[PDB]
Amino acid sequence: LTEDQKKKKKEIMEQESLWKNPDFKGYNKTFQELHQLSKTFANNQFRLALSNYQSGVNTIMKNRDWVEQYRKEEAEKKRLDEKWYWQKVDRKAREERVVYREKMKAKQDALNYFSKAINHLDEIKNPDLRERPEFKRLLSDVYRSWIMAEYDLQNLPQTIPILELYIEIDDNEKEYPAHKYLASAYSFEENMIKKTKGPDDMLFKYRYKKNVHLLRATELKYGKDSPEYKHIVNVIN
Template sequence: MKLYFLFVILFLFHPLFSESSSGEKKIEILIPDGNSGDNNGWGKNPLQFEDIDFLGDAGEENSKSFFDKSKEGYLNAVDRFRKATDLAETKRKDFDQRTFEADRYEWQKRNRRENFENSLTRDINKARSDSVRLLVASMNFLERIQNQKIRDSDHFRELQAGIYREYIKHQLAFRNYMQAMDLLERYIQIGSKYYEDSEAQGYLATCYERIYRLSKKTRDNQARDKYDVLRKKHGLLYAEFKFGKDSSDYKEFSRELFRD
């Protein structure tokens, strides 16, 4: 097995969650942390939207208003969460540079660090929750758009996909796999461009994997069989769109996947 592909396999089956039994293969993609620097929409930079003049000529001013409100909410959600993460990083750097004379023992230093990190986690989680509320409001504005010319436009689909991506990333970070799964299923139905998004297929396979494992524990055989098929189907789609169906990496991935 090539070293590159060995890395891919280790990445995909990384043991993120301790409740699974040892030796079980998993279809889990690491949750994005916003630092990947990718340009496919799943990384740190949000979509950039220009003013869409043609919407005013589409025949329904209310639809244009709803679109603008949805866009504003999306950009606000991204901006607020980014500011929260930037602030947390600034606080962490400041903490690392400080010395605390009261901490004479290692256990005191560890406790102070743990308390500090827990405080940052609470701040980030609150920012995530605030962002999710804004994104849900943005989704609702999109749903209220009735003008079909607007709904069929690339601008509409790009905004919808951007909102979904941000919402999905937050739900994955919260480990809310059912909510993430629901939006991922909608995301890949927006159009062929989004169906062929390898990251989306990988995250969807991750969600199906989690539900599959849960159904095994609860002995829900019907759900287990359903999500066993779905996790493998979308795991293969991830590999197909990531590597190409005729690639050696795809074939090796397939063999590893069906050993589970």
């Protein structure tokens, strides 16, 4: 490969890791680095913004622990009224909706905290401070967890304004997952217009934006005028 392709391979793997579903090792790593930003920045409103973000992520992490425990407790019940196929599926349908609805509540509590993290960053008014890598990386991590919290529950239209705000920050536009999620969420919205028989202007708007971020994600991961790019070029025509 070229020196740029080798570098690119390394970077795409780092970006995929960056957007990894949360776990305990990533939690620790994240709060090491987000605190590293608190170190240089020395700003009480940034500290408060991070304190709220961390409370939001803790909501998510505590929920993941709840979901395993709940499923465990259900599995460990003796199911003597389960002699039918429908009754097994019934109890499955009980599990899935209780788990999904509990995750929906955890999502709101996490987003109320993320909203507070943003409201505190909004109070940093000095443009010399808002342009700091410390300000931008925290704002990026708040948006990323926000995007993922909604994405997991299939709330894809809601991810668009946050992905768009995300890619505007400090070269986030060069992140392959950011364009992959934008393209997928736009695809969903295109499909909604096709299923609900909505207006053509919105059909084409959503289709266009899907193709822009499909093409850009492809360009970023494989390189422009690669067999993989050239393929997307002809399809978008």
